[PDB]
Scaffold this active site. Structure first.
Site, PDB file in Angstrom:
ATOM      1  N   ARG A 117       7.635 -23.239   0.763  1.00  0.00           N
ATOM      2  CA  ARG A 117       7.546 -22.765   2.149  1.00  0.00           C
ATOM      3  C   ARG A 117       8.827 -22.077   2.634  1.00  0.00           C
ATOM      4  O   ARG A 117       9.926 -22.649   2.617  1.00  0.00           O
ATOM      5  CB  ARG A 117       7.187 -23.925   3.107  1.00  0.00           C
ATOM      6  CG  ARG A 117       7.263 -23.589   4.606  1.00  0.00           C
ATOM      7  CD  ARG A 117       6.917 -24.816   5.458  1.00  0.00           C
ATOM      8  NE  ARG A 117       7.021 -24.582   6.903  1.00  0.00           N
ATOM      9  CZ  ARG A 117       7.969 -25.102   7.683  1.00  0.00           C
ATOM     10  NH1 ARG A 117       8.901 -25.883   7.165  1.00  0.00           N
ATOM     11  NH2 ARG A 117       7.992 -24.844   8.984  1.00  0.00           N
ATOM     12  N   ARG A 154      10.937 -20.028  26.111  1.00  0.00           N
ATOM     13  CA  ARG A 154      12.338 -20.385  26.177  1.00  0.00           C
ATOM     14  C   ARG A 154      12.798 -20.391  27.631  1.00  0.00           C
ATOM     15  O   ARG A 154      12.334 -19.578  28.435  1.00  0.00           O
ATOM     16  CB  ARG A 154      13.149 -19.380  25.362  1.00  0.00           C
ATOM     17  CG  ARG A 154      14.186 -19.992  24.444  1.00  0.00           C
ATOM     18  CD  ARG A 154      13.642 -20.285  23.042  1.00  0.00           C
ATOM     19  NE  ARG A 154      14.418 -21.367  22.426  1.00  0.00           N
ATOM     20  CZ  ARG A 154      14.470 -21.639  21.124  1.00  0.00           C
ATOM     21  NH1 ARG A 154      13.795 -20.901  20.247  1.00  0.00           N
ATOM     22  NH2 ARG A 154      15.212 -22.660  20.699  1.00  0.00           N
ATOM     23  N   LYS A 204      -1.816 -23.201  11.604  1.00  0.00           N
ATOM     24  CA  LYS A 204      -1.125 -24.435  11.976  1.00  0.00           C
ATOM     25  C   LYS A 204      -1.665 -24.954  13.301  1.00  0.00           C
ATOM     26  O   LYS A 204      -1.711 -24.224  14.295  1.00  0.00           O
ATOM     27  CB  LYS A 204       0.389 -24.220  12.037  1.00  0.00           C
ATOM     28  CG  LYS A 204       0.976 -23.882  10.675  1.00  0.00           C
ATOM     29  CD  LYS A 204       2.460 -23.583  10.712  1.00  0.00           C
ATOM     30  CE  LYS A 204       3.244 -24.824  11.121  1.00  0.00           C
ATOM     31  NZ  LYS A 204       4.683 -24.541  10.913  1.00  0.00           N
ATOM     32  N   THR A 214       5.332 -32.384   8.924  1.00  0.00           N
ATOM     33  CA  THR A 214       6.221 -32.986   9.918  1.00  0.00           C
ATOM     34  C   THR A 214       6.260 -34.515   9.870  1.00  0.00           C
ATOM     35  O   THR A 214       5.289 -35.182   9.511  1.00  0.00           O
ATOM     36  CB  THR A 214       5.974 -32.491  11.368  1.00  0.00           C
ATOM     37  OG1 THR A 214       4.918 -33.245  11.984  1.00  0.00           O
ATOM     38  CG2 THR A 214       5.669 -30.978  11.407  1.00  0.00           C
TER      39      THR A 214
END
Lengths: 491, 463, 478, 483
Positions: C46, C88, C230, C288
């Protein structure tokens, strides 16, 4: 899963839903739940069992705790919380360090561990409380120090010392715990202190269970049973499996015991971590097959000692224990020393409820039929089958010794089990059985009457409605026998 | 391998299938009826195609006497109506025969020259007409019509037996005539007949009519339609829904008749209503002390199909060996049941009563119970258990005299009369003690007890 | 019990069925470490395009090709993991619990304690009174009280101090940003395709249209590249079945999901998504929060080991290492212990019950090719076969067999390079690249299998070959 | 299914019955046109009953078969030789006049076969009768029309008492229930028929009458030797000894014939159905053909329709799992030899509709470790159901592949393809198999020629076919979709 939509799992559960989870919750008493008010809030949250950890405290302090449990129960007259004494048991510790200053050992560095406990340690040599260390450990053996902080491999053994070699770099303080992976500890499981705690507290203070730390063989269990005697006949024994000896002798331990406590965190100090999960699964399955309660303990919701929410991994870990088939899940420091004792209990009740969402009850029932008979078991089995067949709202387990309730619970029915009993200690013992709730009933009461009373009470509490089917099981002369199964309709 | 084991009397008398015996001059006397009880007779059929009320009353009173010599026995009595039958008469030496005269006088012992007819109005119902005899095997043409006879010419070379069906084209009779009505009302009810087997039933209307005739005076009498023709087969579902049970007689190729017996038994099974296979079972035993292979196999396949009862007709009524026939029937049934038990339970697969009956059969198997006790007042609990064909004996306990007679027709159950004792647990304790005094159970053995309505299943061990 | 306590040899845990994805990074991307990683169990590399430039990932790719030279039998798949949408904060300030915080759409506003800027201009359109807004990796949680056209007023739920330009999350809310921005577009088209990336792990996929857009982007030049959405938020979860239908496979991002969903429901979401990927035969990656402590410690914790194993028992095809390999102190040891946990976990898989469950779970009608795959699995069992051979051009034969989870190893033979590499994410499969008739392809595979000790003389083998018509053959090794 | 009892089974329907039909040859189906009609009606195997006739006489029959097949070139009839084997008979009677015994009457039976018998005394052809039997044994005379119980045994006689009343003639058969008959199963006559007719006349099976021992099968196989390699042995099970030794007999055998009528003379009639069911299931498990024989449709010797009982008996044999059903006097000596084959075929078609196929495969997996070849056969049956295939093609040289598929009883037709003429003949006895002879060659080629003919006669473009091939050693299974 197929045809079931992802958004389904995202519905918030109501208080009414998650309080009706089947898994039982064990809570460790401590300063964080010292007062009656929070004990009461913990009952409402899902607490069924109170663990007294006798690794700390004394007969006076634990008496205050018991007095407070009894007061909480006065505010909740329907709750019949069980009390579990958890023994201190055998311990191994490092000795003292020069100037109380911690020492840092380097990977591949030499550490002498001596048997003279008066020896004030330094970076090169330390003391160990366990006098038979050099006659227990052999070259190649691993010794863990400070909750597995430091790992040393044994290089040489003397009469009163062992030469070891650090496997990693670590900093250790003084008087830290030690583990001896794959080595039997030659210390009494029930020492004089433990004996005093069992006989002079456990018995007269109304403890219903003894959880015995670090059980290494079934002779340990037989020993407690003889210790308990006739005066302690109403106390059930729950060995804690914490090392390789416990694992290797598991079947004989289970046969002698009234149930099992799986201490994952300690087991992870004694075997490769990647095998503890296998051991847990195996031990829960074996408990299930024989119908004896299993408690999953340690490293459950540990971050909640400080946080109002657990981590993802923690929630998953608790849920998987439920799915493995556990009767009980246990909180330790989270309730004893935690900032959120009642929130932690609610959270575990919620995680239990969601895991129980996953349970395939038909496939669990048939899994038990292919794994396991007597009259009592056959009728319990027929009851679960019939309950499912007639879409019964509840199963009534009328029981003196608890056997009948346990045999039905063993089959994990989708229906709630209401165990009815005249025996106070039986009602308390049952707080450890998944899927069972309990109602004490007066003595010398006829079968039909007891059943009539339960159904009308249930109907008044809006648990069952007019017209629904009910399955009642009566085991008579349970362990000396005749067995009934009635199907009846709420009027 | 254990195929070749000879059967002790203890073994084959324990057969589960019920045996209906047709009463006749060869067997109606007290002494042979008692030996038939001993051999496995459970039901006595009175065939009202023959004889009068006086004759049949003599048969009934003999049954009662036989029962006085065997007090433990509870023979049911079935009345089989004449109905719209038109059958041939009896032949010389009971031998089948190979220009022919048909007579109205049914006392005639027929031969190749001349035969009798059960239909007394045959002359008024046919000088050039055609008559089919024995399911269309012989065909005759009427040359002459007399007062009480017909002369025919065999328009076909064929061999015909006795009591065989006769069709008459270009000639309609009711299922229940005045003669049948009289038999049901003036004999059936007052003589203590427990069943009416109604010949040539064609629709559910026939069933309801008989139920209407029976009325409150005959509430204790159960109705068994006989399916004997295509119409009754066509209407079978409706007929069974109304009926209390079914009788399958012979009288669509035979390549398809075998399907009819299997279909009708299976449907009776599913619904827990008793079925009697009455299809000319062991005919050779009218003259021979032993059956043929084919006859034995015919009975066995009935039992395997799931029949509650097998029935003897001429073999007991007009046969040389009535007791031996019942015996060889008991013996066949037993062998067939041998290879008949977890398969039928999983192949049968509801109400609370049935959920518990099913649970009781499973527990019995699981616990290896010696017997299943079925406490019943209407018989339903016993029937619901029995339709699951348990491996263990079903002992049915009832205060109801008529329920206990109706039960004689149910495969797998024996009965015991219990006083109307308002107490289920008392009744079980009491009944276990008599089962001991019959050596049906011993100390240590498991028993499953059932009571329906509050539905109950109890597992105990014999003290 | 002691069967459980059998200390496993390298020979044992190297034969684990579950595939291992490692994330490339400064801690591991050198040729020698990558080689040790191949030996340890690494199956897929990855490249996390959230960081680095095209140069860094190019040299990484170059280092992987060189490592494959040292291991000719190994065929590593490369997976480009996109940056995707981001929110952000603008331009460190502490705000205590209960304090009001304004969040504005004017991104040129320099912020303070009371008012802060957000990069997400459609924030007012997405959010409403009640919603939660997460800032700086969920370290600050604020609750929206009122919404204006170009601003949002919130209340802080905890005391936290946040820095400049930190990430933001919007629990339970669809983020209206392109799932493939112009940057992600450039990464796919001008790196994914030319550098020979086999998979695109698309970050933050929220709908089936996201997946269709990506495949449309790839076009005929990226035909050979498979798409792994994902699943990172609630919108992604709610849209799961339609995403899965378009997808080639799925990556489950537990940590991210744990931001938007109560922790006690993420485990459920994991189980269900894996189950759905299994029933349809598409690979799933669990990512994760794997062995995070091994970033710094040479051994994993009990709880971490247990978490990995439960993913395997749930039915995951792949487990994936992130910071453990990319930046950790023990990248090689981490892979070995990952491989070791997978072995222990597969040790209590009930293979008859998995095949039966799958056979009852799969909806009708099943195809010719799926029927032969099933047959091969059951035959393999009746015959006590040592391995199953899958001769496949597109990879379908191998995938259909693997979804039935046979006890025996599946050895997939293909002349197609892309196919060989796509198969690296498939639990239970080993690949052998071949050049092009069934007979001498089978004969040669037996030689290699025998020498690898996967089969010995006198044992049976099951060979399956799709091409439309399907073949199944049982032979004795000689 | 009520409409299944009503609607008449159309022509094309019954023609497709799965069960095989064995017809006994004789005067009633003497000529070529009758045999041709019996082929259309469903005849698969021709039985020559060597209890009567000779080598010339039975050679005429074969000629007429060879000729009947010329008119039906697609038909491949197996010829089966049924040996006479050992026999026991009563002797002669005064004035050749039949005697009537009253129940309870005493009858002496002597070993002197020259004695002219009486109401009081008869002879028996079996010299070892008195040493074979003891007090309490039953002796059956004239197809069991007379049963007598043995009371006293001497060196050269037995004293008996009649258990029933019967009239018996001269030279009638005799049975000895639960007694081994010490007479050769394969006598000099039987050996002559097997070697000098069986082999050179191209018979495909030997049905050995009255097999009592597995040694009898081994003896026959020894007899055939290299020259009779292509001939398969079907023991007939007729008495207690055949039943006791059945497992051993079946282990050696290529198949089994169950002679029910004879068994009913050797064991209680109520035990014959057990024996039949048991023997068929055992043959089914081990994949060897079983023929149900005797007392099938006997009443059709004289009648154009069978009895209710007869029809049901034939049907139940089919449901027990018989591969073949056999006609004896019905085709050999009856008035309706064609109509009999025909109604037999329709009875078979109808009983096969009652068959729960998925339950048979399920029961077969649990009853029958298992080999590679049987695994692929089973996998083919499963796949065919799964894929809803029109046909299963079985490529076979020894027959083994076709037999292994057929023992799993697929709902679909099994079209067996073979270069071996005798394998094609052997397969005439396997339930659910139809047969096509093929040239002596690639295997993907033979399948194409079988799909390009099934189109003509079975499958339609787009339907699924499962093909199977062995090496009887590796095994293959192809699923293809018709052109």
């Amino acid at each position: 899963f197929q045809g079931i939509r992802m958004s389904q799992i995202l519905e918030p559960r109501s208080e009414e839903d998650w309080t009706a989870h089947r898994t039982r919750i064990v809570c460790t008493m401590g300063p964080a739940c010292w007062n009656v008010d929070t004990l009461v809030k913990m009952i409402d949250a899902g607490m069924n069992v109170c663990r007294l950890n006798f690794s700390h405290g004394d007969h006076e302090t634990h008496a205050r705790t018991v007095q407070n449990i009894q007061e909480a129960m006065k505010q909740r007259p329907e709750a019949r919380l069980a009390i579990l004494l958890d023994t201190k048991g055998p311990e191994i510790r490092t000795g003292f360090l020069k100037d109380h200053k911690p020492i840092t050992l380097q990977q591949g560095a030499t550490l002498k561990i001596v048997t003279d406990y008066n020896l004030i340690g330094d970076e090169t040599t330390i003391a160990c409380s366990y006098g038979a260390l050099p006659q227990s450990v052999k070259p190649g053996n691993t010794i863990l120090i400070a909750d597995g902080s430091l790992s040393v491999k044994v290089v040489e053994v003397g009469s009163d010392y062992v030469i070891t070699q650090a496997q990693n770099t670590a900093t250790i303080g003084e008087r830290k715990n030690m583990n001896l992976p794959n080595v039997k500890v030659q210390l009494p499981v029930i020492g004089e202190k433990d004996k005093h705690d069992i006989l002079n507290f456990g018995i007269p203070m109304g403890c219903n269970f003894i959880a015995a730390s670090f059980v290494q063989s079934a002779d340990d269990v037989r020993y407690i049973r003889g210790l308990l005697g006739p005066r302690g006949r109403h106390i059930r024994i729950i060995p804690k499996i914490e090392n390789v000896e416990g694992l290797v002798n598991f079947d004989e331990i289970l046969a002698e015991a009234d149930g099992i406590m799986i201490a994952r965190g300690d087991l992870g100090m004694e075997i490769p971590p990647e095998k503890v999960f296998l051991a847990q699964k195996m031990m829960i399955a074996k408990c299930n097959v024989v119908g004896k309660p299993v408690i999953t303990a340690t490293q459950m919701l540990e971050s909640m000692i400080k946080n109002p929410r657990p981590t993802r991994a923690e929630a998953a870990d608790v849920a998987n224990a439920v799915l493995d088939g556990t009767d009980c899940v246990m909180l330790s420091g989270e309730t004893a020393n935690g900032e959120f004792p009642v929130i932690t209990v609610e959270t575990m009740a919620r995680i239990c409820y969601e895991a129980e969402t996953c349970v395939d009850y038909p496939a669990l029932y048939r899994a038990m039929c292919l794994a396991v008979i007597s009259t009592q078991e056959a009728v319990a089995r027929a009851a679960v089958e019939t309950a499912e067949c007639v879409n019964a709202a509840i199963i009534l387990a009328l029981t003196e010794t608890g056997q009948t309730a346990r045999l039905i619970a063993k089959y994990r029915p989708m229906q709630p089990i209401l165990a009815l009993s005249a025996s106070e200690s039986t009602i308390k013992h049952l707080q450890v059985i998944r899927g069972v709730t309990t109602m004490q009933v007066p003595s010398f009461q006829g079968t039909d009457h007891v059943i009539r009373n339960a159904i009308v009470v249930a109907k008044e509490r809006e648990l069952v409605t007019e017209g629904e089917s009910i399955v009642a099981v009566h085991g008579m002369k349970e362990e000396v026998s005749s067995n009934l199964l009635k199907v009846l309709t709420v009027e």
